[PDB]
Design a binder for this molecule. Structure first.
Ligand SMILES: [Ca+2]
Ligand SMILES: [Ca+2]
Lengths: 27, 148
């Protein structure tokens, strides 16, 4: 799941999803 | 709290399959620990199992796509209450500044394996920093967290 379209929105999505737990599955 | 849009679901299809190494439609702790391993984290079997079992509503012991949709939709918005939003704030600002600092967020990123540049985290903080303190407080982050 890249971040190129808006970049910020996708990264702010993905990196922040992952931050939810230490062993966090964003999938 | 299970709403996703079609493009959204399509991305989760991808993400799900990226973690689902066997390409069978269910993620095991094996696969998690391996993607974590390549990410630079070695959690325990217990951590990963619990992580699964929390979303594992069907009781099969693995993360199915429907369950993942449930999981993510709650993490991206609400489990019910503002838990998800404050838990996210909590993982960003551990030091208790009341505001998320970019320098700390850069540090947690290194810890999360996302590996973001200072300029990247700076921009992230900058947009979230609504009042312009250079640091984003909870009330500012609440709007930003749901903006995905
Ligand atoms: Ca699998
Ligand atoms: Ca399941």
């Amino acid at each position: 799941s890249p971040a190129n379209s808006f970049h910020f929105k996708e990264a702010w999505k993905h990196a922040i999803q992952k931050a939810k737990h230490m062993p966090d599955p964003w999938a | 709290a299970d709403q996703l849009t079609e493009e959204q679901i399509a991305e989760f299809k991808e993400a799900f399959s990226l973690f689902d190494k066997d390409g069978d439609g269910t993620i095991t702790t094996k696969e998690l620990g391996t993607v974590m391993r390549s990410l630079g984290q070695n959690p325990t079997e217990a951590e990963l199992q619990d992580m699964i079992n929390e979303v594992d509503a069907d009781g099969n012991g693995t993360i199915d796509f429907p369950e993942f949709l449930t999981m993510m939709a709650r993490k991206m918005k609400d489990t019910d209450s503002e838990e998800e939003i404050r838990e996210a704030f909590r993982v960003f600002d551990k030091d208790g500044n009341g505001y998320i600092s970019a320098a700390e967020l850069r540090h947690v990123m290194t810890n999360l394996g996302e590996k973001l540049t200072d300029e990247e985290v700076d921009e992230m903080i900058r947009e979230a920093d609504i009042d312009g303190d250079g640091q984003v407080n909870y009330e500012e982050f609440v709007q930003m967290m749901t903006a995905k």
